[PDB]
Structures are given as C-alpha cells and as structure tokens.
Design a protein around this ligand. Structure first.
Ligand SMILES: CC(=O)N[C@@H]1[C@@H](O)[C@H](O[C@@H]2O[C@H](CO)[C@@H](O[C@@H]3O[C@H](CO)[C@@H](O[C@@H]4O[C@H](CO)[C@@H](O)[C@H](O)[C@H]4NC(C)=O)[C@H](O)[C@H]3NC(C)=O)[C@H](O)[C@H]2NC(C)=O)[C@@H](CO)O[C@H]1O
Length: 129
C-alpha cells in the first residue's frame, strides 16, 4: 500500500507515535517519506546480506527474521514479511523498540540525514489530527 501523507500521520498518531520518546509526529512521517516513500512493500538489500523492510525500512540484521541473514537477531520477534503489510501495526510496534534502543531516531539513516534538525512540522501541515 502506498499511504497518503495525512493518512499515514493519522494511523501513526492512532498507534501512539506522536511524541513517542520525545519525537513529534512530523519526525515519523518525514522518516517514512525518505525511507520508503510511504510504501509498505519497499524492500532494499544491504551489503552485509541483510534486508530492509517496509515503511520504516527495518533491518533484518537486528529486528526481524527473514530466514536468510545468517547469525542476525530477531529483536521484534516477527518475520520480516509482517512488516510489508497494509496494516502498519507490526511496523510501529517494532519501531517503538528500535527508537528506545539508545540511539533514538539516529537508527534511521534517512531521518538522520534528511529530517534531523529540519522543520518537521511541515510534514503534518493541513492534516486533520
Ligand atoms: C548502508 C546503510 O546504511 N543501509 C541502511 C541500514 O543500515 C539501515 O538499518 C540500520 O542499520 C544500522 C547499522 O548498524 C542499525 O544500527 C545498529 O542498531 C543496533 C541496535 O540498536 C545498535 O546496537 C545498539 O547500540 C546501542 C548504542 O550503541 C546500545 O545501547 C545497544 O546495546 C545496542 N543494541 C543491540 C541490540 O545490539 C548499533 O549501535 C547500531 N549500529 C550502528 C552502526 O549505528 C539500525 O538499527 C538500522 N535501522 C533500522 C531502522 O533497522 C536501514 C534502515 O533505515 O537503512 C538502510 O538503508
């Protein structure tokens, strides 16, 4: 599913991401925009053989099981395919664990390079929240 900007903001808010760990909703929508362009089915391969899945581009090296990333962890306790769903629940629960891991949103490279320190409020302009 490709989400609309405001559509994703509502689901995210609903799922408790607004100010989760001190990160305003803007931050989360910006991250989704740059990581997958709001596409739940985005997948990308990394050089170490791990894969990034879904809307938040969650990595198999640490967070999910894809049966093909030898000696990686499955910290969110889910098959990576659960992250590709139209329903963002699994992606959001998993995100919550990632962001609390110590590096905050720096875990997301597109956030760090394109969202961090920008006027993230713009991402939710005109949404009915
Ligand atoms: C080429 C490229 O950059 N591709 C992108 C993917 O790499 C990226 O996925 C992210 O991958 C990074 C790389 O390591 C990963 O970051 C690691 O995360 C673990 C888990 O949190 C860290 O280990 C923790 O360290 C903290 C603080 O040091 C400790 O408090 C804690 O004990 C550690 N936890 C565990 C379980 O070990 C690493 O510190 C950290 N490594 C680095 C180098 O920063 C991110 O978690 C991945 N992000 C996500 C969302 O999965 C992918 C996602 O955007 O994007 C590719 O393009």
């Amino acid at each position: 599913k490709v989400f609309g900007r405001c559509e994703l903001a509502a689901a995210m808010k609903r799922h408790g991401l607004d100010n989760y760990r001190g990160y305003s909703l803007g931050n989360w929508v910006c991250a989704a925009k740059f990581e997958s362009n709001f596409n739940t089915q985005a997948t990308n391969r990394n050089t170490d053989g791990s894969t990034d899945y879904g809307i938040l581009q969650i990595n198999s090296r640490y967070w999910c099981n894809d049966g093909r990333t030898p000696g990686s962890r499955n910290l969110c306790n889910i098959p990576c395919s659960a992250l590709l769903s139209s329903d963002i629940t699994a992606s959001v629960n998993c995100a919550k664990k990632i962001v609390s891991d110590g590096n905050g949103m720096n875990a997301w490279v597109a956030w760090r390079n394109r969202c961090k320190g920008t006027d993230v409020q713009a991402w939710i302009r005109g949404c009915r929240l």
